[PDB]
């Protein structure tokens, strides 16, 4: 299978990037520091759960968009895309191989960070039951890898459209700024400026249009704690959906964007 | 003079930049919004918030302008062409500095006259004597801060050999001179549990040009003119260092 050949090239290409290594080391040391702060303040479990969720939300889209902002537009202007099209390959094989390689890099970074944090929690806090810790941290790695794959597909969509790498970097910066900061500030301004009198039924349903809030709604299901620890995500308690609908919505956010990236890459010539 | 001949080309090439236009438009929009929020709720809170916004964004504009002034011309191959012209290495750097300084002055004039016009239109009974003086000092200090980071970009561009490393060094310069210095000063204040010498902190506040801008716009054993002299020294020493780096490359 040529998909594994493209993925084997992409793994060794992406593991030699130094910005990725620096940001993954920063993520690991920040997760260790947040775990040590939670252990020192320990019951402070929802505070450190929300802090780890916010750290992963701020850092893992950055890792995915730094990996895949030049996957298609960097091959086309590098002259190797036409060469690969003359090789016995399709376009779905190239896209699937790049997605598999970058997803393996994302899963490796997630596993390193949330293994270091779990080891720090296990060594620091005495008498901690492993039945909650293993379940919560496994949910953390699975949802973090899903969020990274969401932004990988976003980067593939934004890279298959442009014809220059600088515009791809600008669109990646705009995508990172829009989904992380701008959407929550827009929702907060809509809630504050209307005092909760602007469509009270439809407003909790707008949280499903941002994957970075579905991630925190997944990871704040077990330990709500206090109502001030979420801000706008206190609107998520009014959602009548069960817990698996958020997982299905994250999978749909992967799939729809991957199909759109395949359509754009197929049309592009 | 060849300085103006290079400065006109630098003016045209900087005004035809998409990233600079986008960041300047966002800066003007944020300044108008800050003026609107200050007018709806007077003078020194709006001045302080605009000073924080300028301290956030004006190093970013000055580093976006000139991170590839020397290394980008070397990679494009026109740097070898320009040295065969009847030209000097000092004249090239001086013309680039003049053009980028005029671009930054035009940017602050637009994005600050918009805020002043919004303040004068929305709030009445505020007259014009204090507003003109405060805003004139404010834009002059903003131009001086932009010229400081312009000279920093001219220092960092001549040392490197590739355009990608210049962006990383400009990002490190932006991080170190805005966030890192004040954070380690605060950490030195906390970890020394209050027995730090009170005569030493306002004089190590002079080692970062961003807080010199805040001390200018927030009016301190220092007088009111040594801040301006320190800002001019921060322009001049970095310009001399950029010229000394440029004269010894290749």
């Amino acid at each position: 299978n040529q998909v594994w050949n493209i993925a084997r090239k992409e793994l060794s290409d992406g593991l030699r990037n130094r910005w990725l290594l620096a940001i993954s080391l920063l993520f690991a040391v920040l997760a260790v520091g947040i775990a040590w702060l939670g252990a020192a303040a320990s019951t402070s479990i929802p505070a450190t759960i929300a802090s780890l969720a916010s750290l992963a939300t701020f850092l893992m889209p950055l890792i995915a968009l730094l990996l895949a902002y030049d996957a298609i537009v960097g091959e086309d202007e590098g002259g190797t895309l036409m060469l690969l099209l003359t090789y016995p390959l399709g376009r779905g094989q190239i896209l699937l191989g790049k997605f598999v390689g970058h997803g393996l890099i994302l899963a490796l970074a997630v596993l390193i960070g949330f293994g270091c944090a779990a080891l720090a929690i296990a060594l620091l806090v005495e008498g901690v039951e492993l039945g909650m810790l293993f379940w919560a941290f496994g949910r953390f790695m699975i949802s973090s890898t899903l969020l990274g794959w969401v932004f990988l597909a976003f980067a593939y969509v934004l890279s298959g459209k442009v014809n220059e790498k600088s515009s791809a970097a600008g669109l990646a910066l705009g995508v990172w700024f829009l989904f992380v900061l701008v959407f929550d500030l827009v929702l907060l301004a809509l809630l504050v400026l209307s005092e909760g009198k602007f469509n009270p039924e439809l407003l909790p349903w707008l949280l499903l249009l941002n994957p970075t809030d579905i991630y925190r709604l997944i990871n704040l299901s077990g330990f709500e704690g206090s109502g001030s620890a979420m801000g706008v995500l206190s609107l998520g308690a009014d959602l009548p959906v069960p817990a698996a609908v958020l997982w299905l919505c994250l999978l749909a956010w992967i799939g729809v964007s991957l199909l759109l990236a395949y359509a754009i890459f197929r049309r592009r010539l | 003079n060849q300085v103006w001949n290079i400065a006109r080309k630098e003016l045209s090439d900087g005004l035809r930049n998409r990233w600079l236009l986008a960041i300047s438009l966002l800066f003007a929009v944020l300044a108008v919004g800050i003026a609107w929020l200050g007018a709806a709720a007077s003078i020194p809170a709006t001045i302080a918030s605009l000073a924080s916004l300028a301290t956030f964004l004006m190093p970013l504009i000055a580093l976006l302008l000139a991170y590839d002034a020397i290394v980008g011309e070397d990679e494009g191959g026109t740097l070898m062409l320009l040295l065969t012209y009847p030209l000097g290495r000092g004249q090239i750097l001086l013309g680039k500095f003049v053009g980028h300084g005029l671009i930054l002055a035009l940017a602050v004039l637009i994005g600050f006259g918009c805020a002043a016009l919004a303040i004068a239109l929305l709030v009445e009974g505020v007259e014009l004597g204090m507003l003109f003086w405060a805003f004139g000092r404010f834009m002059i200090s903003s131009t001086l801060l932009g010229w400081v980071f312009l000279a920093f970009a001219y220092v960092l561009s001549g040392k490197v050999n590739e355009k990608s490393s210049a962006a990383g060094l400009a990002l490190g310069v932006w991080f170190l001179f805005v966030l890192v210095f004040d954070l380690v000063l605060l950490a030195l204040l906390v970890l020394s549990e209050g027995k730090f010498n009170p005569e030493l902190l306002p004089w190590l506040l002079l080692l970062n040009p961003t807080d010199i801008y805040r001390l200018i716009n927030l009016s301190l054993p220092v007088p009111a003119a040594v801040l301006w002299l320190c800002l001019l020294a921060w322009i001049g020493v970095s310009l001399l260092l950029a010229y000394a780096i440029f004269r010894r490359r290749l």
């Binding site: 090239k9 290409d13 590098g78 002259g79 190797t80 036409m82 090789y87 016995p88 | -």
Partner: protein
């Protein structure tokens, strides 16, 4: 036959790009493609490579359809400007391309000793010059056992020695049954190694054939110069009896232009009287034939001191 393009009239919508191109490539030929106006050469490139589907006619590469794996494992393509992956090394890029083409990995060693990259097989591609990247592109082009090479400017940035050695390797490959298509804008330099030339203008194929059949079809003046001639005053006028204009530029550098129909009597006149030093029999080269065939398709010479 290797390439059997028949009746292709490829269009980009409301305008006609290619118009009735009938090109038959044999086995062991080094036929080259020339042309600068219009996208006639590039559309033919993508038609042979299978990147473009013909709107009319049929393209047959190696007997089969040009988008099959069995003809894409037997085809070598060297593009114009390939940057490759700057973080990978020389061995890893060739191993990746050999795994993609399904070739053997041991050849990855031999090809790296075949062009120039035995010493620099461990350094990254970001520390490579233009000629080294051309060597790497040739090395991935010769992967497996290709039967059709489609090189696009193979000697841009290369050595004056490696150019000669690359053409020697191309002659070795054409002596074993492979067929090469060379595209280049440097017409002096490829005219000593091709077997056929195809000139394209305005989308149409103006002339095809060997370099002797092109000179037979195109009546062109032969530009013979007898440098170091013994006598020049009667050499100004002895060639003009049969219509060969005798124009001189130095003490003895006279370029007599003939009519290509009286070559025996001019050589008899040159050899019976007067002793020469080094006669340069300047036949109409590929540049002059290209100029004539662009003029025949509709073109005007530029003014003096222009372009």
């Amino acid at each position: 036959n290797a390439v059997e393009i028949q009746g292709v009239s490829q269009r980009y919508g409301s305008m006609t790009v290619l118009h009735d191109l009938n090109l038959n490539l044999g086995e062991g030929e080094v036929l080259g493609l020339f042309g600068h106006n219009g996208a006639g050469k590039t559309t033919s490139m993508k038609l042979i490579l299978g990147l473009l589907s013909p709107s009319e006619g049929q393209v047959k590469v190696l007997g089969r359809a040009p988008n099959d794996p069995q003809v894409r494992r037997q085809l070598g393509y060297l593009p114009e400007n390939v940057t490759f992956y700057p973080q990978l090394s020389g061995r890893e890029t060739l191993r990746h391309f050999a795994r993609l083409k399904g070739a053997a990995l041991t050849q990855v060693d031999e090809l790296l000793e075949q062009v120039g990259l035995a010493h620099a097989a461990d350094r990254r591609v970001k520390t490579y010059s233009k000629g080294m990247r051309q060597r790497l592109g040739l090395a991935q082009a010769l992967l497996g056992e290709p039967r059709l090479l489609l090189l696009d400017e193979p000697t841009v940035g290369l050595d004056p020695i490696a150019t000669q050695d690359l053409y020697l390797l191309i002659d070795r490959l054409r002596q074993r049954g492979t067929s090469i298509i060379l595209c280049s804008h440097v017409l002096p330099g490829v005219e000593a190694h091709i077997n056929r030339a195809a000139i394209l203008a305005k989308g149409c194929l103006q002339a095809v054939g060997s370099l002797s059949q092109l000179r037979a079809e195109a009546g062109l003046p032969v530009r013979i110069r007898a440098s170091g001639i013994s006598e020049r005053d009667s050499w100004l006028q002895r060639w003009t009896d049969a219509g060969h204009s005798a124009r001189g530029l130095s003490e003895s550098s006279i370029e007599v232009v003939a009519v290509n129909g009286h070559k025996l009597v001019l050589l008899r006149q040159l050899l019976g009287e007067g002793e020469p030093e080094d006669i340069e029999i300047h036949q109409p080269s590929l540049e002059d034939l290209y100029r004539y065939y662009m003029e025949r398709a509709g073109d005007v010479r530029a003014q003096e001191g222009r372009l």
